[PDB]
């Protein structure tokens, strides 16, 4: 099982000091810190086996190509996709959603159709669908929230109809920490012939994820939140849908033939969706990140994190005038407001105490609006965070209270 | 000035051995090796200042945001853009071309219009325009080649007309090493009201590049060819055009406001075109790469490389039955065929001698077709390559000749 202290000693940024104080990094929901195994796997790859990966003859290139197709496989196993060919390497969740929206969206959603998202979505699971609806004349319908941060599921009967082509929904909210009941919802959507895109940017680091049990048609996530590098993410599409999708970006490596007088032909899935040099260094790093989480055990992480969350919720009970947002069973993040202070001031005092939290709309304006607040403060409690970091948060909020109140 | 030996000692992969032999990496045109200053700038950033960059309050995040906006500025200075706000961070040249093609292309090229590319383009400067022409009903016209690997400029009068909305052309060919006369061509295009997109993936590492003197409207290049990481590239657009372009990817950070009942508004250029977490690690690395080239001096590099090229061309003169393709003044790469052996066999023998060259169509099928060959072999002679690596190439080709002939 889990030793938080052994885990923290893998993360070099956690030794840092900030504003002369010891960093309490509580913003892993925005981007996670990377263990040195991740950092060094990327660096070693650049120091020793670097080459172009376009299935080259020469050795380094042939080896780099295989290391990359191994990360594809490993990622596919990590989410239990049926095969490696169902995963497309993207820049991150956001790019993965725009690829679906354009490639699948353009040939499957028509004027008069509708698409459903929820009021808790992140802007990455909003904007691309908004753009698709404008382009084709479809309607974007929304599942409303309940006060407690959970979706009003009683509204589906009225949102799902025979024009519903897609449900795009978050696994886990980045502000509320709510986990949506994806499997039952996917069951429902599928009964109307609607596909489901699952945004799992805040799910893959907290517990095991199984796309076959989910039965989601599309699943997306980013590496930088899952202790990996930036610039790399994964888009999973069911083989049967991926095989009919037309290309989105065009260029090198995604074509089979290119003619200036007979036109161009495409290569097969997944490679049809990856144009030009891939972020090979980010792919190697992402494989390291996946091996590092799998070796900790998602179920040991989940367990440590859950207990940390319970500890935090319980101590925050003694911060006066604290508003929490979201369900009690929240995963990963704690979204809150302190009395009437603007979150911006609350996060500047916390920052000034060496405590990193995220403050603002969190790329979720419609969720702020639902709560009728312009912004919120948010703490992430990841696998490398401690009781002591929690205590500093509580104390800092109490002091912010005393001083500004 | 330039010490090739001092330069090589910065590149860790050049000490490697391959197939038990000392690597002679002659494939920098496909992707370049990275100096340890580049590798370590990325790694240090992850070990010590890592955070989300979405203009966060907390310290690390505020610092990461500034490091990134400094790389934007530095890149803008490296190509002499008038300002930092004319550069968009992309995955690489390919993504930069698809962004222009969609964002600018969709609102500016209509049914009946035409777009001009050349017969030497790379697939990245082909495919996106092919897709745009299919979507809107425009015609893709091509500047033909001369035998020597130079464009037939006498054909422009017949290709440019009042329906020509764009010229997309390479700076430097990745197979022939030809440098197109961009400034005069841009002058011409502009006289018809056509914009010009310059593909400079093979220009930025060989000599200084100045987008104001060029007067190109769009310029693209990738970091992995310019001694930098993967997953990061630059798209330069003239401020006046960039300011009217609508967004391409949607999501976090590129919006000003997001409403589920009043619609969404956009932020300003460049940030309107960057959705979701950026490849922050690749950006830091790209800044290191830019500082490392600028400190060598593009003009010292150009000079060393040119002399290396002259040395190579002269020794290859004693390889029997060698076909070279491209002009004598070629930059960077040497494209060739050995007698009647398929390039694939030539590159496997070379590989087996520890010599990495690229063999195939090089993501330029129309250029192979022009030469009526399915493929070619290609050597890159970059700033870290030596006379001795050239000699091994020549010797290996002579032996391949003797054995297979």
Task: Examine residue B93 and state whether it is found in any structural domain, yes or no.
Answer: yes
In whole angstroms, give the CA distance from residue A115 to residue B179: 49
With tokens 């698809």, the residue in question is B98
CA distances from B139 to A251, A367, B306 (A): 18, 46, 38
Residues B304 and B285 in one domain: no
Residue where a domain stops, chosen among B254, B271, B296: B296
Q: How was this structure determined?
A: X-ray
Contacts of B363 in chain A (CB under 8 A): 54, 251-253
User: Looking at chain A, how many residues does it have?
Assistant: 405
Structure-token match 């390497």, residue found:
A89
Q: Which of A26, A281, A343, A346 to mutate to test the interface with B (most CBs of B within 10 A)?
A: A281
Of A47, A91, A94, the CB nearest to B13: A47
Which residues of chain A does B18 touch, with a Cβ-Cβ cutoff of 8 Å?
58-60
* Half-sphere exposure at residue A100, Cβ-oriented, CA atoms within 13 angstroms: 33
N-term to C-term CA, chain A: 43
Q: Which of B255, B278, B296 marks a domain boundary?
A: B296
- Asked, for residue A105, whether it belongs to a domain, the answer is yes
Which of A15, A224, A246, A250 has the most B C-beta neighbours within 10 Å, making it the best mutation to test the interface with B?
Answer: A250
Answer yes or no: do A16 and A68 share one domain: no
Tokens of B116: 């001009």
Contact between A171 and A141 (Cβ < 8 Å) = no
Shared domain for A319 and A272, answered yes or no, is no
Q: Do B260 and A126 touch (CB under 8 A)?
A: yes
Residues B13 and A50 sit within 8 Å (Cβ to Cβ): yes
Q: Does B271 share its domain with B358? A: no
Chain B interface, best mutation among A20, A31, A365, by max B CB count within 10 A: A31
| CATH of residue B228 | 3.40.640.10
Tokens 């050239």 found at: B390
B216 is catalytic: no
Place of tokens 């006289």: B191
Set of chain B residues whose Cβ sits within 8 Å of the Cβ of A35: none
Q: Residue A251 domain-assigned?
A: yes
Contact A57 B351 (CB under 8 A): yes
∠ CA A374-A149-B251 to the nearest 5 degrees? 55
| CA-angle at B172, arms to B328 and A47, nearest 5° | 105
Contact A12 B365 (CB under 8 A): no
How many Cβ atoms sit within 10 Å of the Cβ of residue A48? Answer: 12
Q: Write phi, then psi, for A264 (nearest 5 degrees).
A: -120, 150
Place of tokens 């976090």: B252
Contacts of A281 (CB under 8 A, 6+ apart): A42, A45, A46, A229, B229, B230, B231, B282
A281, A215 in Cβ contact below 8 A? no
* CA–centroid distance for B174 within its chain: 8
Residues 6+ apart with CB under 8 A from A204: A78, A79, A221, A225, A226
Name every chain A residue with its beta carbon within 8 A of the beta carbon of B26: none
Reduced 3-state DSSP string for chain A: CCCHHHHHCCCHHHHCEECCEECEECCCCCCCCCCHHHHHHHHHHHHHCCCCCCCCCCHHHHHHHHHHHHHHHHHHHHCCCCCHHHEEEECCHHHHHHHHHHHHHHCCCCCCCEEEEECCCCHHHCHHHHHHHHHHCCEEEEECECCCCCECHHHHHHHCCCCEEEEEEECECCCCCCECCHHHHHHHHHHCCCEEEEECCCCCCCCCCCHHHHCCCEEEEECCCCCCCCCCEEEEECHHHHHHCCCCCCCCCCEEEECCCCCEEECCCCHHHCCCCCCHHHHHHHHHHHHHHHHHCHHHHHHHHHHHHHHHHHHHCCCCCEEEECCCCCCCEEEEEECCCCHHHHHHHHHHCCEECEEECCCCHHHHHHHCCCCEEEEECCCCCCHHHHHHHHHHHHHHHHHHC
Question: Cα Rg for chain A, rounded, in angstroms?
Answer: 22
Shortest Cα–Cα distance, A366 to chain B (Å) = 6
Give domain status of residue A405, yes or no. Answer: no
Dist. CA B180–CA B377, nearest whole Å: 22
Which tokens hold the place of A47? Answer: 């120091």
Per the CB < 8 A criterion, the answer to whether A22 and A261 are in contact is: no
Name the residue among B157, B163, B112 with its Cα closest to residue B133: B112
The conformational region for residue B67 under phi > 0 = left, psi -120 to 50 = alpha, else beta, is alpha
Query: Which residues from A are below 8 Å from B252, CB to CB?
Result: 94, 122-124, 363
- The β-bridge relationship of strands B333-338 and B376-380 is antiparallel
Distance CA(A78)–CA(A72), nearest Å, equals 10
Looking at the domain assignment, is residue B374 inside a domain? yes
Report how far residue B313's alpha carbon sits from residue B326's, in angstroms, rounded to the nearest whole number: 12
Radius of gyration of chain B from its Cα atoms, rounded to whole angstroms: 22
How far are the Cα atoms of A283, B143, B152 from residue B155, in angstroms, in the given order?
Answer: 44, 7, 6
Q: What residue of A is the nearest CA neighbor of B263?
A: A130
Does B302 reside within a domain?
A: yes
Same domain, B350 and B248: no
Alpha carbon distance B213, B181 (integer Å): 12
Residue B125 falls within a domain, yes or no? yes
Instruction: Tell how far CA B157 is from the center of its chain.
Output: 28
* Residue from A401, A338, A400 nearest A373 by CA: A338
Written as six digits, the tokens of B280 are 């922050």
Same domain flag for B274 and B183: yes
Decide if B363 and A277 are in contact by the 8 Å CB cutoff.
no
* CATH number of residue B24's parent domain: 3.90.1150.10
Smallest CA-to-CA distance from B242 within B80, B57, B405, B99 is with: B99
Residues B67 and B13 in one domain: no
- Cross-chain CB nearest to A357 (options B42, B58, B344): B58
Backbone phi and psi for residue B242, each to the nearest 5 degrees, phi listed first:
-55, -40
Give Cβ neighbours of residue B260 (< 8 Å, ≥ 6 apart).
A117, A119, A126, A140, A142, A366
Q: Which domain holds residue A273?
A: 37-296
CB A225 within 8 Å of CB A205: yes
Q: Quick check: is B178 in a domain?
A: yes
Angle at A172 (CA atoms; ends A124, A135), nearest 5 degrees: 25
Tell me if B50 and A33 make a contact (CB, 8 A cut-off): yes
Is-contact A68 A84, C-beta < 8 A?
no
Tell me: do B196 and B268 sit in the same domain.
yes
The reported resolution of this PDB entry, expressed in Å, is: 2.2
Residue of B nearest to A13 (CA): B48
Domain count, chain A: 2
Tokens of A108: 């499957």
Cα separation, A49 vs A64, in Å, equals: 7
Closest CA to A219 of A231, A206, A209, A230: A209
Q: Which residue of chain A comes nearest to B17, CA vs CA?
A: A48
Is A224:A230 a contact under the CB 8 Å cutoff? yes
Of the CA atoms within 13 Å of residue B359, those in its CB half-sphere come to 21
Whether residue B319 sits in one domain with residue B274: no
Calculate the CA dihedral of residues B93, B94, B95, B100 and round it to 10 degrees.
Answer: 90
Verify that A7 and A48 share a domain, yes or no: no
What is the SS3 string spanning chain B? Answer: CCCHHHHHCCCHHHHCEECCEECEECCCCCCCCCCHHHHHHHHHHHHHCCCCCCCCCCHHHHHHHHHHHHHHHHHHHHCCCCCHHHEEEECCHHHHHHHHHHHHHHCCCCCCCEEEEECCCCHHHCHHHHHHHHHHCCEEEEECECCCCCECHHHHHHHCCCCEEEEEEECECCCCCCECCHHHHHHHHHHCCCEEEEECCCCCCCCCCCHHHHCCCEEEEECCCCCCCCCCEEEEECHHHHHHCCCCCCCCCCEEEECCCCCEEECCCCHHHCCCCCCHHHHHHHHHHHHHHHHHCHHHHHHHHHHHHHHHHHHHCCCCCEEEECCCCCCCEEEEEECCCCHHHHHHHHHHCCEECEEECCCCHHHHHHHCCCCEEEEECCCCCCHHHHHHHHHHHHHHHHHHC
Residues A371, A329 within the same domain: yes
Q: Would you say B144 and B119 are in contact if contact means Cβ atoms under 8 Å apart?
A: yes
Residues A337 and A210 in one domain: no
For residue A97, how many C-alpha atoms fall within 13 Å in the half-sphere facing its CB?
A: 35
* Chain B residues closer than 8 Å to A350 by CB: 58
Contact yes or no for A282 and B281 at CB 8 A: yes
Of B236, B268, B296, which closes a domain? B296
Q: Are A196 and A216 in contact (CB under 8 A)?
A: yes
Cα–Cα dist A238/A242, whole Å? 6
């Amino acid at each position: 099982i889990f030793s938080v202290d052994k885990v923290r000693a893998d993360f070099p940024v956690l030794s840092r000091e900030v504003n002369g104080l010891p960093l309490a990094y509580l913003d892993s929901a925005a981007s996670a810190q990377k263990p040195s195994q991740v950092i060094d796997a990327e660096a070693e790859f650049y120091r020793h086996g670097y080459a172009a990966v376009h299935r080259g003859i020469h050795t380094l290139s042939a080896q780099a190509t295989e290391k990359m197709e191994n990360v594809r496989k490993r990622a596919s196993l990590f989410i239990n996709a049926r095969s490696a060919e169902e995963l497309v390497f993207v820049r991150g969740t956001t790019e993965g959603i725009n690829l679906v929206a354009n490639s699948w969206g353009n040939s499957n959603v028509r004027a008069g159709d509708n698409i459903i998202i929820s009021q808790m979505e992140h802007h990455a699971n909003i904007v691309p669908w908004q753009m698709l609806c404008a382009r084709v004349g479809a309607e974007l319908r929304v599942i409303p929230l309940n006060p407690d941060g959970t979706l009003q599921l009683e509204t589906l009967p009225t949102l799902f109809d025979e024009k519903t082509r897609l449900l795009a929904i978050t696994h886990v909210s980045n502000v509320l920490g709510t986990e949506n009941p994806l499997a039952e919802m996917i069951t429902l959507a599928h009964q109307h012939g609607a596909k489901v895109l699952v945004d799992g940017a805040q799910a893959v680091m907290h517990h095991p994820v199984d796309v076959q049990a989910l039965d989601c048609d599309f699943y997306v996530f980013s590496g930088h939140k899952l202790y990996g590098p930036t610039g790399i993410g994964i888009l999973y599409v069911k083989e049967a849908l991926l095989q009919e999708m037309p290309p989105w970006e065009g260029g090198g490596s995604m074509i089979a033939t290119v003619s200036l007088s007979e036109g161009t032909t495409w290569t097969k899935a997944p490679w049809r969706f990856e144009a030009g040099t891939p972020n090979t260094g980010g792919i190697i790093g992402l494989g390291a990140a996946l091996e590092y989480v799998s070796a900790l055990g998602l179920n040991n992480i989940a367990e440590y994190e859950q207990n940390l969350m319970h500890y935090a919720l319980s101590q925050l009970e003694s911060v006066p005038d604290l508003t929490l947002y979201g369900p009690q069973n929240r995963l990963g993040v704690i979204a809150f407001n302190l009395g009437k202070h603007h979150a911006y001031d609350v996060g500047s005092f916390l920052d000034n105490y060496g405590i990193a939290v995220r403050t603002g709309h969190h790329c979720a304006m419609p969720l702020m609006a639902y709560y009728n607040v312009p912004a919120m403060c948010r703490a992430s409690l990841a696998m490398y965070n401690t009781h002591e970091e929690v205590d500093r948060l509580v104390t800092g909020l109490q002091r912010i209270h005393r001083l500004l109140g």
